[PDB]
From a paper:
[name] is a conserved RNA-binding protein important in neuronal and muscular development in Drosophila and mammals. In the fly embryo, [name] is important for the morphology and growth of the neuromuscular junction and regulates cytoplasmic vesicle-based messenger RNA (mRNA) transport. Importantly, we showed that [name] recognises an hEXO (GGCU/A) sequence in a set of [name] targets and mediates their exosomal enrichment. We identify a cryptic RNA-binding unit that recognises RNA with high-sequence specificity and show that this non-canonical RNA-binding domain is responsible for hEXO recognition in [name]-mediated exosomal [name] partitioning.
In order to investigate the non-canonical N-terminal RNA-binding region of [name] and to provide a structural framework for our studies, we set out to determine the structure of the N-terminal region of the conserved N-terminal ‘acidic’ and RRM1 domains (NeR1 construct) in Human and Drosophila [name] proteins. The Drosophila protein crystallised in space group P21 with two copies in the asymmetric unit. The 2.2 Å resolution X-ray structure was solved by single-wavelength anomalous diffraction (SAD) using a seleno-methionine derivatised protein. Finally, we observed that two high-confidence and five candidate RNA-bound peptides mapped to the amino (N)-terminal region of [name], overlapping with the ‘acidic’ domain that has previously been described as a putative protein-interaction unit. The presence of multiple high-confidence RNA-bound peptides in this region indicates it likely plays a role in the interaction with target RNAs in the cell. Analysis of the [name] sequence with this algorithm revealed high-probability RNA-binding activities not only in the RRMs, but also in the ‘acidic’ N-terminal domain. This indicates that the N-terminal ‘acidic’ domain, although specific to [name] protein, contains patterns of short sequences often associated with RNA-binding sites in other proteins. We also show that the domain is functionally and physically coupled by a structural element to a second RNA-binding region comprising the RRM domains, and that the coordinated interaction of multiple [name] RNA-binding domains is the basis of efficient recognition of the full-length [name].
Numbering used by the authors:
A (entry chain B): 22 to 104, 122 to 243
B (entry chain A): 22 to 105, 121 to 243
Amino acid sequence: GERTEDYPKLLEYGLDKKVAGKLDEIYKTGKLAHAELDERALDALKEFPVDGALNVLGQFLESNLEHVSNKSAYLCGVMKTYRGPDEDKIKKILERTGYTLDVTTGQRKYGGPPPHWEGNVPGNGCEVFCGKIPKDMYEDELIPLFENCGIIWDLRLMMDPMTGTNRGYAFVTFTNREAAVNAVRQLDNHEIKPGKCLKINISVP
Amino acid sequence: GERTEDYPKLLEYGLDKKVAGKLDEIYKTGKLAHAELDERALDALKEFPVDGALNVLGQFLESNLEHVSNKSAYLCGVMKTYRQKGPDEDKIKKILERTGYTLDVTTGQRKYGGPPPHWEGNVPGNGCEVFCGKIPKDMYEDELIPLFENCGIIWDLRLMMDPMTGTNRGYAFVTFTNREAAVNAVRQLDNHEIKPGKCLKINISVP
């Protein structure tokens, strides 16, 4: 295909030809729209060393952007840093619970709130910390694990915007305190992977 | 031992002394309070022959009254049945604790959730419900709930009961929070051998 209508706009703005061509490729993919890239974001991109900019746009184009409700703010997140899971397991999980999945540069959030949730959030009394998570793991394996403890209100897997893997920990909020305590009691020191034991702590002792 | 302060109140109401005696004995056990039974239930009891009234009270005494919110309606249910056992409570306690769901027991039904805690908006409805048949008559929701929990999120579960026997009628309805879960339950659990030689019959409520 030919260049998009916004290609010469990028060039006029003073972007390096190579950087402008890469961003335009992103435009034609549909990952991003030119109408949602502010002059601030373009300036930041312009301030990048050329091969730096190419890598950032390269990482953006070659990343799983499914369930990313804000592609623009995501790219900006990638830029600040430089400055996925089994899709069919995920699909089946989201279908059967109806829960939202939202991915940002530093987090993959499952639910929070669940569909049709009434009243206040459970809070931190119903929340547990889950540390020492194997970096290769995602919520497709974490969610079924914690579902046995009770009803997940949310699950937030913290992500490394650079490495692409998780930061090795997550928070899980259940709909009540007893489920949280249940998770601590039964899943602390759980060998989720050969040689890899999780660390589960109640957020509010 | 001595009789409760509600014993003479029963006698004043015109209850046969023998019937009032047995009812007051039920009061003592804590399974029932005089405040719980309303006049409609007592009148129905008074119309009963003494031999009949005594056995209605006997069946009530022997009933699993755990999680029965409406004792009056339960007593009336036994009476209407006459003119014609339970879950592992440690399992139930754990389930109810981790989910926070209500459990309500009537003479003809054991109901889990419906609605769940903190449910806002539209009920899932019949489109998200499955029929579960050929349930072994000795099975209760302590075993049925963990089975259907793997399929999706249970909005409610209604195990139908035989007021005559106190065992189930061999079928239940399960409503999930969406239809994908319901369809999932049908696909994965139809003909599920829940006990050796006993396979469940799961049908979507709305084909």
